[PDB]
Amino acid sequence: IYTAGGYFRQSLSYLEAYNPSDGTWLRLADLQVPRSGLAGCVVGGLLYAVGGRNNSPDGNTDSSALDCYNPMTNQWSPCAPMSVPRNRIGVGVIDGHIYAVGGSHGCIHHNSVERYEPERDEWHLVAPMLTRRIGVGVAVLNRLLYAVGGFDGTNRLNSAECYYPERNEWRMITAMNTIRSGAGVCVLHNCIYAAGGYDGQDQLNSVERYDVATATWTFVAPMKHRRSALGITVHQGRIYVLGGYDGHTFLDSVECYDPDTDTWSEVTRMTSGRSGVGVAVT
């Protein structure tokens, strides 16, 4: 479990790895620009950091950057930047290709989406979403791209839509039961999970999951601690959520979801509390 970037009074350069077996934290090479509100993913075994923002005492620069971490070089390397800066981006990987979804640049909330090819180092625009979405959760299932929740600049969203690559088109699907911006969104086997987030009034601990075969969202066991802007990933068939903000403190808590008994429990404590991280596994 690798977490990159994040926010704790300023955007951070931390790259750290958590081990669910031995429970100890590995501290690794720093990002070559601090970022929060970024997304992380893995392609070809290399970890990509996508978008985000450097919120510092001397600036607040939205990031168009794409950069590559190699787990046995302990080295970061820059890749081609995106069309636009995307703070609070979501990403998903189809066929080893990078889809960058939504996010913001200043007051502009993107509905734009663009595709990166790792072995060509190229971005190009695809069809935009039906909705402008920042803090969108993104997941991939059955070679389809799902954009879930988010914020359009005015309303926070329970809607979700689906991208079909070979038709270049977005399809609205059944909305979530809960409005969520900055939730953790991932696949645990074959339910698209949406955990936590912010509905414009409170940070959430509720978790719900989408069943494609019935096009139904159903609620499962909620987290122990409400959290928004959390990282999320699935390891060994279990879901891990990392940090976030609960309206009062930047959480270092990390929770595990065991799907077969449907319970959450405290697994570990991050080295420092933070929100807005990028998380991925390799």
Partner: peptide, 7 residues
């Protein structure tokens, strides 16, 4: 600086 992310 906002309730969703803490920033």
């Amino acid at each position: 600086g906002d309730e969703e992310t803490g920033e």
